[PDB]
Amino acid sequence: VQLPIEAKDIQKLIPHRYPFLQLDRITAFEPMKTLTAIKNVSINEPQFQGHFPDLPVMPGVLIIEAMAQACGTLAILSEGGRKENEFFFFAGIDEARFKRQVIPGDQLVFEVELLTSRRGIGKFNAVAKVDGQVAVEAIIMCAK
Amino acid sequence: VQLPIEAKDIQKLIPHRYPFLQLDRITAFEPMKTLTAIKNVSINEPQFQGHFPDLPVMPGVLIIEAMAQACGTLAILSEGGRKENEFFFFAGIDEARFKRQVIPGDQLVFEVELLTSRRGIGKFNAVAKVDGQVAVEAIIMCAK
Amino acid sequence: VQLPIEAKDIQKLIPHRYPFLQLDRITAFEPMKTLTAIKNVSINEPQFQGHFPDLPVMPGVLIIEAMAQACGTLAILSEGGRKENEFFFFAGIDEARFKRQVIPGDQLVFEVELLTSRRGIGKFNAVAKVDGQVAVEAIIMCAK
Amino acid sequence: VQLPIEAKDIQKLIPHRYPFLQLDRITAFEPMKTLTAIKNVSINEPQFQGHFPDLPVMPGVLIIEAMAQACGTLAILSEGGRKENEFFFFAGIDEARFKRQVIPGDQLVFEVELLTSRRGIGKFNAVAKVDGQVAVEAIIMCAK
Amino acid sequence: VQLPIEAKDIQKLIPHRYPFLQLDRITAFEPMKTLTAIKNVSINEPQFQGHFPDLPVMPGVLIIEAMAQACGTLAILSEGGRKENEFFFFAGIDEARFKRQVIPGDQLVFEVELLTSRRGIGKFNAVAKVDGQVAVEAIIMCAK
Amino acid sequence: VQLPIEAKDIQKLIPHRYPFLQLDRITAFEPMKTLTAIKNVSINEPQFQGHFPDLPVMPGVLIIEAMAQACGTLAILSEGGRKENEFFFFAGIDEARFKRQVIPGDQLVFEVELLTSRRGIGKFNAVAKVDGQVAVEAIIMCAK
């Protein structure tokens, strides 16, 4: 697979579309092992009308959603799949901590790792950094 | 406090606004203990443009966000507070399981419970039901 | 036909899409006679940015539009039709009364009835209830 | 009062905001009698994402809503009122006929007339024209 | 070609969609020479949430974008092309002056003219009028 | 002034709001001379629903708008002004070339310079880079 995977091509892999596509670009990929993706945070995003009116703060849950989407794409790429034939459900979130406020101008770097794969259910470790510092970390479960 | 607390009044309690206000109404409240809230799921919501284009599925993370908002309002109401004083951060998610697809037409009923309050950090149990069945359950941490 | 008809399948019947699809689910249907549909009202809907800024109130005209859509789907289902082969125009509204404020958290229940079918023009009676109380009633004309 | 009343000033008269402000400009006004207003129809309006995906057609109910807003502003201007003191409810619609498809590029001209004012309830005749042809006509009731 | 070209058909010619389709209707056309198009400005457009919060002012750059789209369609129509085969890039803007505030209620009339076509790069003169007065004028370059 | 200036504070300087605030952060500033600002490009931005449906491409005109906003803020900061105080109009664009496609994932770096200030009219040179490469360059005029 050709890196980086641009947003236009992430869309060929997963069905998510605006305003629920929370990855901009896949930058690293080791089959069945790891993936790096980014999401640029901009004040021109729909969530910032309401979160919060004069104080833009990237919602943690959207960072979580990006983490899950990264995990899902890692899985999909690993079996050479596409959006038309395969779906991985978001099954659970495990040890999610929100450590840093993320704001417009920040580039989120997501690093995810496949830990265990018992019976179509994948357990992943996922972290989201801004400028090297951890902003959110969590364990993410996906189910085929 | 006068029940039900309508959306217009939820907004006097928390700063969240469209499209990140994910409670429609508070229906039950026991100070320092429990709260029930609802969120109506409709096809006329912004997330359903992209999640997913022909197949509307309420994103789990938005159900999580609602659960967190319910926990936070339970806390706020318990110290008779408002949106303009100080704030409860979303600190973590613990044991979140996504058990049922939620779809337009479903009314989400959120029941949350304050478990422990060890030094500014509140640990809550939260469940989200549709028609009596559990759709999502999770432990939610908020920090003052 | 299999009830309830979910939003995803309402979209196979009528061309309306976000933000102008104002039915969430079809719950009852008697061919050439009656139909029940619901629409969940949530603060997370686009109209509530502007109607009104701090006071969410479901616009009557959108309740009217839902009524018309329910009438139209009753008609379509009655001739086993689809969205791709022909269209029922909204021809007129006759004795529309707005009796109750509808607000986030309310579930609108729409009950519509085919009265007469003189000359490709269908005259319907339509009512919209919240919790058993009438909120809006009207006569709706559709033309094939 | 100074004519034309621009959108910026229509907003000082009525509480409606995006996406539910359906008048662009007030062009004529006779106290307690008549008003003319316009609404420009553009493909760059939020309703045209869904109404309909490849076939932009101005929803009749929004034309109705504009008619009602024109009536309401006629009333407000007639008692020299503002958005912060007075509210006129939309009470009913009477003899509404949808005669012409309205499309992007059309400028809607609204001409409304106060017929009767029995006990705080105002009955108005309203027509909406494009290029001189009637597109929608209706009787509009507002209540103080 | 059949005039006027309505928005529904402009979309068969160029790929631009909501909220970046800034032409409502093509009204005049001389192959390889000139084109007239209109864009209705309405308070019900997404840019007016932010530009500016209580003071709606049509952004100059969107007028520029419309001018470019008009130039592009003039080119496309001139080689009988469509959106699925041929595309013209926006290459530059030359002598753009913003002379008049444009506001809701204004109808923008765009008149564009092909000046030179040296080697796939088309240089156009473009003006945008409201009620005959120039609001914006510019030279627009497109590249095949 | 304290650098970086975050989006929340850019808003105290200029009246632009969603979806027409096209700067995320001010990173450099020399009074009456230069300014650097960034804008993160994400697939989660409103323009990418329509520009273009399956092929996200940052519109050149929005890059232009950002360049102008950067120029304007340079000016505002230089006379210690604010948004409630006064306003710099966008007066013209001079020698604008679009050299590179900008896509989700790209961070735009804007570097602007005050050239001349002949009587309330400021002439600026402006460039927008992604990863060191020029994407757009232009001369920007603002008028007080």
Say which of C51, C83, C100, C144 is annotated catalytic: C51
Beta-carbon pairs below 8 A across chains E and F: 91
For an interface test with B, which of C12, C43, C48 has the most B Cβ atoms less than 10 Å from its Cβ? Answer: C43
In chain B, what residues touch A16 (CB-CB under 8 Å)? 50-52
Extract the tokens encoding E64: 């520029």
DSSP, collapsed to helix, strand or coil, labels residue F60 as: helix
Residue type, E98: F
d(CA E92, CA F60): 9
**Which resolution, in Å, applies to this structure?**
2.6
CATH class of F1-144: alpha beta
d(CA B59, CA D51): 25
Among the partner residues B6, B55, B104, nearest to C105 by beta-carbon distance: B6
Asked about C16 being catalytic, the answer comes back as no
**What is the gyration radius of the CA atoms in chain B, in angstroms?**
14
Residue of A nearest to F5 (CA): A105
Question: Which positions ≥6 away from E132 have C-beta within 8 Å?
Answer: none
d(CA F144, CA F122): 8
- The DSSP string of A53-112 is TTS----HHHHHHHHHHHHHHHHHHHTT--TTT---EEEEE-SEEE-S---TT-EEEEEE
Give bridge partners of residue E51 from the DSSP assignment. Answer: none
Q: What's CA E116's distance to the chain center, in Å?
A: 18
Helices vs. strands in chain F: H and E counts, helices first: 2, 8
Residues of D engaging E, defined by a Cβ cutoff of 8 Å: 4, 6-8, 10-11, 18-19, 21-25, 38-49, 54-56, 103-107
Which conformational region is residue F3 in: left (phi greater than 0), alpha (psi within -120 to 50 degrees), or beta?
beta
E8-41 burial, b at 16+ Cβ within 10 Å, e below that, comes to eebbebbbbbbbbbbbbbbbebeeeeebbbbbbb
Cα angle for residues B119, B124, B130 (degrees, 5° grid): 165
CA proximity to C28, closest of C126, C112, C95, C121? C112
Extract the tokens encoding E109: 């009339």
Q: Tell me which chains share at least 3 CB pairs under 8 Å with chain C.
A: B, D
B128-138 burial, b at 16+ Cβ within 10 Å, e below that, comes to bbbeeeebbbb
CA proximity to E34, closest of E82, E70, E87, E83? E70
d(CA A47, CA A66): 14
How far is the alpha carbon of C126 from chain B, nearest alpha carbon, in Å? Answer: 20
Q: What are the CA-CA distances from residue B128 to residues B54, B70, B108, F53 (Å)?
A: 25, 11, 6, 35
d(CA A73, CA A89): 12
Catalytic residue set of B? 51
Among the partner residues B11, B19, B106, nearest to C44 by beta-carbon distance: B19
Q: What is the CB neighbour count within 10 angstroms for residue C118? A: 8
Residue F121: phi and psi, rounded to 5, are -100, 115
HSE of E87 in the Cβ direction (CA atoms, 13 Å)? 8
Q: Give the β-pairing of B25-30 and B34-40.
A: antiparallel
* Cβ pair D45:E49 closer than 8 A: no
Among the partner residues E19, E38, E106, nearest to D44 by beta-carbon distance: E19
The alpha carbon dihedral of A88, A93, A97, A103 has a sign of positive
Residue B14: phi and psi, rounded to 5, are -125, 150
DSSP A2: P
For tokens 């997501």, what's the residue? A110
Extract the tokens encoding F119: 């009587």
Q: Where are the domains of chain B?
A: 1-144
In chain B, what residues touch C131 (CB-CB under 8 Å)? none
Query: Do residues C57 and B7 lie in contact, with contact meaning Cβ atoms separated by under 8 Å?
Result: no
DSSP, collapsed to helix, strand or coil, labels residue C108 as: strand
Residue E52: asked if its preceding bond is cis (omega within 30°), the reply is yes
Helices F60-78 and E60-78: angle between axes, nearest 10 degrees: 160
CA proximity to A43, closest of F106, F24, E47? F24
Residues of C engaging B, defined by a Cβ cutoff of 8 Å: 4, 6-8, 10-11, 18-19, 21-25, 38-46, 48-49, 54-56, 103-107
In chain E, what residues touch F126 (CB-CB under 8 Å)? none
For an interface test with F, which of A41, A44, A47 has the most F Cβ atoms less than 10 Å from its Cβ? Answer: A44
DSSP, collapsed to helix, strand or coil, labels residue F76 as: helix
For an interface test with F, which of E13, E93, E140 has the most F Cβ atoms less than 10 Å from its Cβ? Answer: E93
d(CA E9, CA D143): 43
